[PDB]
Amino acid sequence: TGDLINTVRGPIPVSEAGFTLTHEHICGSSAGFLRAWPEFFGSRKALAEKAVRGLRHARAAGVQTIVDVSTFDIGRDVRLLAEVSRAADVHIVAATGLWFDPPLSMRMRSVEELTQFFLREIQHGIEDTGIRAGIIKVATTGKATPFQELVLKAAARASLATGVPVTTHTSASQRDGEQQAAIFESEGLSPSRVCIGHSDDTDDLSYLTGLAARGYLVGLDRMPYSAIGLEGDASALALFGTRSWQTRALLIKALIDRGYKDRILVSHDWLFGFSSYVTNIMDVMDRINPDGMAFVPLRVIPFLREKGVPPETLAGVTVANPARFLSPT
Ligand SMILES: CCOP(O)(=S)OCC
Numbered sequence: 001t002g003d004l005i006n007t008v009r010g011p012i013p014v015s016e017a018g019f020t021l022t023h024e025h026i027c028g029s030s031a032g033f034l035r036a037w038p039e040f041f042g043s044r045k046a047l048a049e050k051a052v053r054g055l056r057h058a059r060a061a062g063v064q065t066i067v068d069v070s071t072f073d074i075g076r077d078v079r080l081l082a083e084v085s086r087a088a089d090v091h092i093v094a095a096t097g098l099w100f101d102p103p104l105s106m107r108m109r110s111v112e113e114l115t116q117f118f119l120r121e122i123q124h125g126i127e128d129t130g131i132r133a134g135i136i137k138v139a140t141t142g143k144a145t146p147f148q149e150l151v152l153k154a155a156a157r158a159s160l161a162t163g164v165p166v167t168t169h170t171s172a173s174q175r176d177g178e179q180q181a182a183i184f185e186s187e188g189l190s191p192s193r194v195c196i197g198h199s200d201d202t203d204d205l206s207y208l209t210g211l212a213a214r215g216y217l218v219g220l221d222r223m224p225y226s227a228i229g230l231e232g233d234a235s236a237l238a239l240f241g242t243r244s245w246q247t248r249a250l251l252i253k254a255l256i257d258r259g260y261k262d263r264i265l266v267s268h269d270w271l272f273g274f275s276s277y278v279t280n281i282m283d284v285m286d287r288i289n290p291d292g293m294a295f296v297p298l299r300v301i302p303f304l305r306e307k308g309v310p311p312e313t314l315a316g317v318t319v320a321n322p323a324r325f326l327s328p329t
């Protein structure tokens with residue numbers, strides 16, 4: 001008791017986060033896009049309503065908190081997050097950091113300037129809203145670009161100053177987490193402050209246990225993503241991949257069976273609107289996974305339970321691990 005985490009509706013006790021999905025999005029977009037072209041989503045009101053229905057569904061399934069890891073360049077709209085969080089009665093933790101679509105005004109910045117930006121969003125507030133980020137999101141897609149090196153270092157520095165954790169996008173098949181880990185450790189950041197995300201996009205357990213053994217959190221965060229059935233659709237295939245959700249979920253069991261139950265974070269990487277990809281992609285996603293952010297508690301957790309993962313273990317993964325990760329440390 002007494003540890004707090006910042007949400008888009010203000011501070012909450014860590015012990016009230018409960019069942020937490022640690023990598024999710026209300027809307028995957030671009031900076032300024034929802035303001036300039038809300039009709040792309042039908043309307044802003046249509047997007048918010050869709051998001052409220054989805055989160056209420058997740059809530060009815062036992063989800064109490066999501067971490068929306070949309071950054072500035074994923075077009076994070078913190079007023080939107082606050083509105084849908086209030087309406088659905090689900091906590092939303094917002095993010096600072098940068099993903100892999102930074103505009104030139106970010107790409108021209110130094111490590112010091114990036115550090116100052118991430119600190120502003122954590123310590124002062126995002127935009128003019130007063131809402132504080134509770135996580136820092138970074139990305140590589142292969143070997144880090146020079147700019148991405150700075151971002152990761154700035155993320156380490158902001159995390160060391162504030163205690164707020166860092167979470168990452170990787171190309172998991174290219175094993176990005178190893179260089180990400182090397183950069184974070186070069187800055188003196190503790191591996192227990194760090195989640196290496198999209199780690200279920202690979203079945204390479206040498207790579208995953210290597211990270212887990214060093215104390216990283218392994219983000220198994222794209223549970224419902226499968227394009228099995230959709231080989232007609234090139235963009236759906238590139239996005240979803242060709243592994244079943246059961247294959248992804250088996251990784252959670254695999255890590256638990258190797259002693260790594262406390263190093264695991266589970267999520268969907270779901271969204272309710274998606275403008276940074278092909279048009280109508282949200283109809284394809286909703287057909288593949290009509291349960292949205294309820295998919296983990298409805299499908300994945302019982303799957304694990306039926307494979308013989310004990311309930312206390314499942315609770316530790318979906319409640320205790322996110323609480324520990326999010327508590328500023
Ligand atoms: C399938 C979604 O991929 P990302 O987590 S990199 O986010 C796009 C908003």
Ligand SMILES: [Co+2]
Pocket residue numbers: 168169170198
């Ligand atoms: Co990502």
Ligand SMILES: [Fe+2]
Pocket residue numbers: 023024025069269
């Ligand atoms: Fe994501």
